[PDB]
Amino acid sequence: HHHHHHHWGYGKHNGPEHWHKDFPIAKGERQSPVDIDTHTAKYDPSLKPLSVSYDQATSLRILNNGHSFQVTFDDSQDKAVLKGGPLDGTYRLLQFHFHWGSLDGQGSEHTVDKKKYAAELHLVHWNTKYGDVDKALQQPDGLAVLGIFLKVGSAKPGLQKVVDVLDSIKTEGKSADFTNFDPRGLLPESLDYWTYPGSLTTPPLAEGVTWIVLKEPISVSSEQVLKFRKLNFNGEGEPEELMVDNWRPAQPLKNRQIKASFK
Ligand SMILES: NS(=O)(=O)c1cc(C(=O)O)c(Cl)cc1Cl
Numbered sequence: 001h002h003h004h005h006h007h008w009g010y011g012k013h014n015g016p017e018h019w020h021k022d023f024p025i026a027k028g029e030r031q032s033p034v035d036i037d038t039h040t041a042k043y044d045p046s047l048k049p050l051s052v053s054y055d056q057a058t059s060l061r062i063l064n065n066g067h068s069f070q071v072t073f074d075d076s077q078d079k080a081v082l083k084g085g086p087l088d089g090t091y092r093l094l095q096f097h098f099h100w101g102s103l104d105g106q107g108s109e110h111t112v113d114k115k116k117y118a119a120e121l122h123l124v125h126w127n128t129k130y131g132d133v134d135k136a137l138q139q140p141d142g143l144a145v146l147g148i149f150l151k152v153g154s155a156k157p158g159l160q161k162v163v164d165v166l167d168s169i170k171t172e173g174k175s176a177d178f179t180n181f182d183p184r185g186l187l188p189e190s191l192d193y194w195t196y197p198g199s200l201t202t203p204p205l206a207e208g209v210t211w212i213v214l215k216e217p218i219s220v221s222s223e224q225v226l227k228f229r230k231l232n233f234n235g236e237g238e239p240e241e242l243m244v245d246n247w248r249p250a251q252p253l254k255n256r257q258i259k260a261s262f263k
């Protein structure tokens with residue numbers, strides 16, 4: 001009988017279309033992202049507003065991991081947490097990262113009534129009742145991701161401290177100290193959201209994520225998102241391959257219901 005055990009990426013040869021070969025959970029019923037069909041999405045008056053408590057958030061480092069860039073946080077205490085919305089309990093912010101396109105007309109992972117945004121911001125949190133992120137990763141209610149759409153318009157002031165250091169992490173494996181960054185400067189004004197049970201959108205595509213996708217996009221300038229597109233998927237000394245189109249497309253919703261926090 002069959003038995004199951006090159007690196008994944010976003011290229012023709014190793015992109016989303018192929019991930020199912022090493023990560024067969026891609027074939028399952030809880031995969032992210034999804035298209036949010038607003039007609040289908042049922043307003044659920046029993047969802048609470050999302051309580052974002054980032055008042056003490058302690059950023060640590062910023063790094064290029066070869067598939068995105070991310071800002072890490074001290075998650076040893078409840079410095080930056082999510083609760084309420086659809087969540088039971090407290091989730092601690094570990095990291096945020098982005099996905100974006102080669103052009104403004106694509107780049108988001110989630111879509112809304114089939115519309116793609118220019119980019120999507122993901123704030124990754126883990127359920128404190130499991131003690132750390134490695135234990136949480138193993139559970140169905142282990143993680144919560146707050147997803148935020150980016151459109152191109154006016155500059156996002158809170159994003160500028162990030163953009164101003166991207167030249168220091170151009171290539172894979174580069175990182176830098178990145179202290180005193182306030183993630184509140186990346187939120188939109190309204191915290192109205194859609195929620196559904198899903199997965200990581202990157203391998204290993206584990207099905208343990210409560211997704212919270214905000215209705216309202218933030219706007220960033222063309223100049224800012226152009227700075228994203230100057231990152232490299234490659235290492236220093238390797239041929240240049242610009243880090244663009246690092247998004248997985250919408251996956252089948254199957255039997256899941258997406259709920260809205262708003263009428
Ligand atoms: N795209 S995602 O589903 O938010 C996600 C991405 C990553 C990643 O760094 O590749 C991680 Cl560790 C966790 C999550 Cl939850």
Ligand code: NI
Binds near residue numbers: 001002003
């Ligand atoms: Ni066997």
Ligand SMILES: [Zn+2]
Binds near residue numbers: 122
């Ligand atoms: Zn992500």
